[PDB]
Design a protein around this ligand. Structure first.
Ligand SMILES: NC(=[NH2+])c1ccc2[nH]c(-c3ccc[nH]c3=O)nc2c1
Ligand SMILES: [Ca+2]
Ligand SMILES: [Mg+2]
Length: 223
C-alpha cells in the first residue's frame, strides 16, 4: 500500500495473509471455514494466517490454518485477469473473536464516490521497494467507470472497477493482491491489478465482488 497508514493491530479483523513459506497475497475471511482472495494468487500449499498484524513476529493473536481446497472461478482468464477471484476452504474452522472476524458480502454494488478501506502488507513505494511487516491501510473512493476505462482502454470488463486517486500518490501495490476493499461494511472488491503503483492516471483495478455473490454462496454450500 503506497501513501497509506499503519492500520493498528487487529483493527482489520477479516484480513488474512496467505503464506507458502512467506507472505505472497492477502485475502478476506467471509465465515469460519472460507476465505476469498484473487485467482492470480492461486498456489498449491497455502497456509492461511489470521489475526496478524506484524507478519514476522508471533504477537499472540494469530491462527495459522492450512487450506483443504482452493477453487478458482470457472471463467478466470489469466491473460486479462477477468473474474479474478478464488475461494479457499480452511482445514479447520477458525475461532472468531475480536481479533478474527469475517466480513459481510454485499447485497448490492456500491456507487462511484463511495469511500472504501483497502489494506495489505504490500510494497509501500511507487518507485522503489520497501515491504512493511505490519498492516497498512488506505481509504480511497470508487472512481467512475468512465475514468477507469479511459485509463485502461479495452482492458476493463464489467467485473472490474477502479478505486484510488488519478493524481497518484495513494494506491494498493504488489503484495496487496487478493486483499479486501471494504465499503460501507461490505466486501466490494479484491486487489487485482494496476499499472505500477500510485502513478498518475493509473488507479488500481479491483475485482467487483457484488457480481459473484451467488457463485460464492452456492460454491461454499456445496463444498
Ligand atoms: N497498482 C495496483 N493497484 C496494483 C495492485 C496489485 C498489483 N499486483 C501487481 C503485481 C505485479 C507483479 C506480480 N504480481 C502482482 O500481483 N501489480 C499490482 C499493482
Ligand atoms: Ca504476527
Ligand atoms: Mg491485502
Amino acid at each position: 500500500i503506497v501513501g497509506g497508514y499503519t492500520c493498528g493491530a487487529n483493527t482489520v479483523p477479516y484480513q488474512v495473509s496467505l503464506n507458502s513459506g512467506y507472505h505472497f497475497c492477502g485475502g478476506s475471511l467471509i465465515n469460519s471455514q472460507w476465505v476469498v482472495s484473487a485467482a492470480h494468487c492461486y498456489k498449491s500449499g497455502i497456509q492461511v494466517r489470521l489475526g496478524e498484524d506484524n507478519i514476522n513476529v508471533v504477537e499472540g493473536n494469530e491462527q495459522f490454518i492450512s487450506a483443504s481446497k482452493s477453487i478458482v472461478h470457472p471463467s478466470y482468464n489469466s491473460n486479462t485477469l477477468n473474474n479474478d477471484i478464488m475461494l479457499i476452504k480452511l482445514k479447520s474452522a477458525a475461532s472468531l473473536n475480536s481479533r478474527v472476524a469475517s466480513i459481510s458480502l454485499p447485497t448490492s454494488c456500491a456507487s462511484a464516490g463511495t469511500q472504501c478501506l483497502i489494506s495489505g502488507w504490500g510494497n509501500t513505494k511507487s518507485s522503489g521497494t520497501s515491504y512493511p511487516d505490519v498492516l497498512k491501510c488506505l481509504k480511497a473512493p470508487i472512481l467512475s467507470d468512465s475514468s477507469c476505462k479511459s485509463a485502461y482502454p479495452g482492458q476493463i470488463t464489467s467485473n472490474m472497477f477502479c478505486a484510488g486517486y488519478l493524481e497518484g500518490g495513494k494506491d494498493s501495490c504488489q503484495g496487496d493482491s487478493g486483499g479486501p476493499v471494504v465499503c460501507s461494511g461490505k466486501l466490494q472488491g479484491i486487489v487485482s491489478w494496476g499499472s505500477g503503483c500510485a502513478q498518475k492516471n493509473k488507479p488500481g483495478v479491483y475485482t467487483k465482488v457484488c457480481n459473484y455473490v451467488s457463485w460464492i454462496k452456492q460454491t461454499i454450500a456445496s463444498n
